[PDB]
Design a binder for these strands. Structure first.
Lengths: 82, 128, 140, 60, 110, 116, 204
RNA sequence: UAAGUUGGGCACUCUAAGUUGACUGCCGGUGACAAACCGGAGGAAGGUGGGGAUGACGUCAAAUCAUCAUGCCCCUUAUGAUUUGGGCUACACACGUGCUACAAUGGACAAUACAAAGGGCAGCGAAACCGCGAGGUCAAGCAAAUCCCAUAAAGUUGUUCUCAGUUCGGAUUGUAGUCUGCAACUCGACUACAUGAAGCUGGAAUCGCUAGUAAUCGUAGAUCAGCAUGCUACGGUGAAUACGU
RNA sequence: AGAACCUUACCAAAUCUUGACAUCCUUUGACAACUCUAGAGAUAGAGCCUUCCCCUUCGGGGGACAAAGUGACAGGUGGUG
């Protein structure tokens, strides 16, 4: 479950810190599979690589029921007719 | 006084049956049989030794038994009692051979073979 | 061919109780089955107070069938051991199918009613009689 | 393919638990015994060969 | 009903009455019998003045009238409002931890 | 294992078989007024004859020990009579259904006794 | 499978193990070290046709015994080559060794020797049939209670996998008091692989 | 002595290696007198006592070039390959296996008993403390008949639920925590709380079991840094059925 | 007989082409532990250190390689039971 507090990658954090000191940036190329929701990612945007192409998704103010690891299933159409 | 000895080995249960003079009764691990062996009103079989062997003079029993289930332990008492009756005097050896319960039953749980499952059931057949 | 029968019984008076404790021993558990059949013993000795031996003997002497069947159907003479076994199996089947409230009210009602030579036990008895007598056309 | 797996499991790993105990003589990925570092079939092959001093089957 | 919530079976034991509707539940039976003393005295409703003296206080913290309903409603509102990375799998019957659905019968699904 | 053809062969073989067994088997001293019924396999190579005899459990045995010898004559004449290509081998067996059916009528007494 | 190498069942009853050492939980190290010497054996195999080796592990020393096809040059003229083999083994296994070369049984009645012989004969473009006839002839001349050699694969430069067997005498396989020698070999010239399993039954 | 912890012996059991023993080896009968068959005595083992490995010739152009090797054809600045995400597991679905319930022989609560086998050196975590539990923390002994994993469940002793979609039932999701993993989301397991669908023994068809048997209820091992409704091994209760082809 | 990464054979991206790995020739040699930086990581630049350890009669071998050239090549979970 949860260990070492919130789990990060310690290098995407460097990029977000560098781009957050000035006016916030709405473009961030990343992988975002070893990161969790925490208040320092508010107001930014992330392009999570689901496996074919990373797609930007903007951070909202209500990140309690969502995680930035995945925004859409890597199974496109979820392997079903409907 | 004199004390005879017998043993019962069946269903991986060994009872070190020791026979002593007295009214005729048992002490399984220095305890009574009724509550030690759960739902064991079957002591009729356990006292069948007294009803069919050596007239009906009951002989006190002291038993130290470990291993196997409670029913297997109970039947293991019978073998030790029968052995003690045998070694008391050979007169009833033939009668015990003719009264049953003397030939030790080698029937214990056997091995598990591949193909069985949680229920010991062979695999099914390719139906439909 | 061998049967591996068991002689002794906690209640020595009747040896059919061995078959009883064996068949009611479902799901690999013996203690509670023996407990509930003792409860049936007690209640049948209590309701219409009499020794359970007589009522049980009436049940095991009136519900015994003489007509069975072994794409052709033929009546066949029944061996006494198979007849008693089938009777006891039907008794436990009635116990299961009745599905009454208490542990043993169904069992005691079954044995008492079979002793009365009435009820679903004799209904199944006459079903066996008439179903087998319908098959007599293949006897010749 | 596995020709680069034989070295990848031998090359550096990003963290503590990143490897698998593959066979040494064989390259079979799955069904390996960690006590011998050998796959399922290699153990049988050497046991039929009598290399290990362990006792034979049918002892129970 | 009278004690709390919406309706309570009549002439029944308390342990099932408190769990007939959204409420304390019967998994907390050990905790409630350790804290409170109102239990199944007998299978009928024997609610007297001595009864309900402190069981209402013991269960007071468990406000269950529409609390679970509002919690679930806001959760699904966030689900279908915010990006539905879980909402997409909530239509097919998959939990947060996954189900690997293969035998999709007509219970959860249309 | 049975076809209409086997049934016709059985009927027409029964008619001739009863005739021969009671009108041409002289030599066996134990002749018996018999009734018969015959069944065959689908391929007409095997035939079972079922019959009844009058007498004790030594007279049925004498008659059987006589039928056993006479089988050759029966087969010869039967092949000399019928158009069928392959002579089925013949074995003679009592029709136990006669006694079994009679025992089948026996328990009828039990049903009528308890209800009266 | 239907047929399994019988020396697998034979070992542990009448015959000793192929490799022997003291017992401990560190069997992985011992086996992975022994595999290196087993693979190194091929260097002496390719010239002396050594049947097999029994390796022993003393308190801190290693003892081996090879069954060479001829001892004259494996022992050298006066020990001109054993020392370098010992040194190479010491370097490769990171531990010393005590080589004790013993010549295989004087008669070429063993299994692996003749298996390699017929494998090389096939690889040298010689009729497997005539080679087998010579092998069984000298096998019965030398005296053996039972001997069979199977072959499989694309024999005689063909494209069909056929199998042949040429046995002689009483050969009890299901019997356990047999004391047999199962062998194997691989041979080819330009076509796939052609496996041969020679079986020897010497005494009961 | 709480307790085989201690002094004393290996008496019993148990414990591993030699030795008798069930081999037709004796009797009576049957059988062409023979082989053999039946019954018996002795006898634990009576007609090979039981269980397990050993699977003839071969059949399936059965499976494996993906353990490995392997002849040939092809790419060999890609048909080789370093690193990051997933994916083999998606669902209108069907399939077969396996697990869980449809129950009051039952469920729920409380005291209480019987087992063997396997692994263990940095692993097996004695006792104990804390916590809502998972588990957190400290901590004994042990290269093993010493010590641990680890308690056996059903069952015995009393009670309750009283025939309902049930004090049956946990599918479903949500809330807050635990072990391991830097990481538990496609993507581990467990816990405390709530929610409570179907299912009230299942139609034609259909599989399994011949005695310590099924069925049932527990235990251990590997798979693993952690993750078994799968597998193997061990243990407990324990029946009728085969007249007959 | 263990699918979150490694695991995996596929796709996308960052990417090299005697290649990821390994051997044969030579320039030669105990194989680089840790940090800063560009980079999603790889990888790369460096600071730093890997660093004759065994025989060494002074070489050399081997013995690992730090990087390089070389022709083979290696390689295919590419195919064919």
């Amino acid at each position: 479950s949860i260990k070492k507090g919130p789990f990060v990658d310690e290098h995407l954090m460097k990029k977000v810190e560098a781009q957050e000191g000035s006016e916030k940036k709405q473009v961030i190329k990343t992988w975002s599979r070893r990161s969790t929701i925490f208040p320092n990612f508010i107001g930014h945007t992330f392009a999570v690589y689901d496996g074919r192409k990373h797609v930007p998704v903007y951070v909202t103010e209500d990140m309690v029921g969502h995680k930035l690891g995945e925004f859409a299933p890597t199974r496109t159409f979820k392997g079903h007719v409907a | 006084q004199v004390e005879y000895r017998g043993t019962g080995r069946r269903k991986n249960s060994v009872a070190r049956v020791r026979l002593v003079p007295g009214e005729g009764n048992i002490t399984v691990n220095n305890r009574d049989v009724r509550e030690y062996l759960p739902f064991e009103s079957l002591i009729l079989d356990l006292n069948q030794p007294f009803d069919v062997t050596e007239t009906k003079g009951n002989y006190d029993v002291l038993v130290n038994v470990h291993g196997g289930g409670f029913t297997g332990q109970a039947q293991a008492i019978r073998h030790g009692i029968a052995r003690a009756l045998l070694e008391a005097d050979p007169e009833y050896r033939g009668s015990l051979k003719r009264a049953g319960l003397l030939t030790r039953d080698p029937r214990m749980k056997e091995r598990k073979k591949p193909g069985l499952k949680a229920a010991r059931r062979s695999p099914q057949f390719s139906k439909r | 061919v061998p049967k591996r029968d068991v002689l002794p019984d906690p209640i020595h008076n009747s040896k059919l109780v061995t078959k009883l404790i064996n068949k009611i021993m479902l799901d690999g558990k013996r203690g509670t089955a023996q407990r509930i059949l003792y409860s049936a013993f007690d209640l049948v000795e209590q309701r219409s107070g009499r020794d359970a031996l007589e009522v049980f003997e009436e049940a095991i002497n009136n519900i015994m069938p003489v007509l069975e069947v072994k794409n052709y159907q033929v009546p066949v003479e029944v061996r006494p051991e198979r007849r008693t076994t089938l009777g006891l199996r039907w008794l436990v089947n009635y116990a299961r199918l009745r599905g009454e409230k208490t542990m043993e009210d169904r069992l005691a009602n079954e044995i008492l009613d079979a002793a009365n030579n009435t009820g679903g036990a004799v209904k199944k008895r006459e079903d066996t009689h008439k179903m087998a007598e319908a098959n007599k056309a293949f006897a010749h | 393919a596995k020709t680069s797996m034989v070295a990848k499991q031998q090359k550096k790993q990003k963290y503590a638990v990143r490897e698998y105990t593959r066979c040494e003589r064989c390259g079979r990925p799955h069904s390996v015994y960690r006590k011998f570092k050998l796959c399922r079939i290699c153990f049988r092959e050497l046991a039929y060969k009598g290399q290990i001093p362990g006792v034979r089957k049918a002892s129970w | 009903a009278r004690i709390a919530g919406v309706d309570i079976p009549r002439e029944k034991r308390v342990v099932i009455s408190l769990t007939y509707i959204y409420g304390i539940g019967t998994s907390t039976a050990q905790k409630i019998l350790e804290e409170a003393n109102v239990s199944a005295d007998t299978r009928v409703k024997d609610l007297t003045d001595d009864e309900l003296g402190r069981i209402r206080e013991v269960v007071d913290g468990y406000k269950v009238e529409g609390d679970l309903r509002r919690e679930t409603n806001l959760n699904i509102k966030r689900l279908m409002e915010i990006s539905s990375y879980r909402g997409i799998r909530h239509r097919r019957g998959l939990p947060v931890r996954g189900q690997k659905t293969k035998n999709n019968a007509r219970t959860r699904k249309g | 294992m049975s076809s209409m053809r086997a049934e016709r062969v059985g009927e027409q073989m029964k008619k001739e078989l009863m005739d021969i067994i009671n009108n041409k088997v002289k030599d066996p001293r134990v002749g018996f007024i018999t009734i018969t019924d015959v069944v065959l396999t689908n391929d007409l190579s095997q035939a079972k004859v079922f019959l009844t005899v009058l007498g004790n459990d030594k007279e049925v045995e004498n008659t059987f020990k006589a039928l056993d010898k006479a089988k050759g004559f029966i087969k010869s004449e039967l092949g000399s009579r019928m158009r069928l290509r392959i002579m089925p081998e013949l074995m003679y067996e009592y029709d136990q259904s006669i006694e079994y059916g009679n025992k089948i009528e026996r328990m009828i007494q039990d049903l009528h006794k308890q209800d009266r | 499978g239907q047929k399994i190498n019988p020396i697998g069942l034979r070992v542990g009853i009448i015959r000793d193990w192929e490799a022997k050492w003291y017992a401990e939980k560190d069997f992985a190290s011992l086996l992975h070290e022994d595999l290196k010497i087993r693979k190194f054996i091929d260097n002496e195999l390719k010239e002396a046709s050594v049947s097999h080796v029994e390796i022993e592990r003393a308190a801190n020393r290693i003892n081996i015994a090879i069954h060479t096809g001829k001892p004259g040059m494996v022992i050298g003229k006066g020990g001109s080559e054993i020392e370098k083999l010992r040194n190479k083994l010491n370097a490769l296994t990171d531990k010393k060794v005590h080589i004790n070369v013993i010549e295989i049984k004087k008669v070429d009645l063993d299994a692996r020797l003749v298996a390699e012989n017929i494998a090389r004969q096939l690889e040298n473009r010689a009729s497997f049939r005539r080679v087998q006839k010579q092998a069984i002839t000298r096998a019965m001349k030398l005296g053996a209670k039972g001997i069979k050699t199977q072959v499989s694969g694309r024999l005689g430069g063909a494209d069909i996998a056929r199998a042949e067997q040429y046995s002689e005498g009483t050969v009890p396989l299901h019997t356990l008091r047999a004391d047999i020698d199962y062998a194997h070999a691989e041979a080819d010239t330009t076509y796939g692989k052609l496996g041969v399993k020679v079986w020897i039954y010497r005494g009961e």
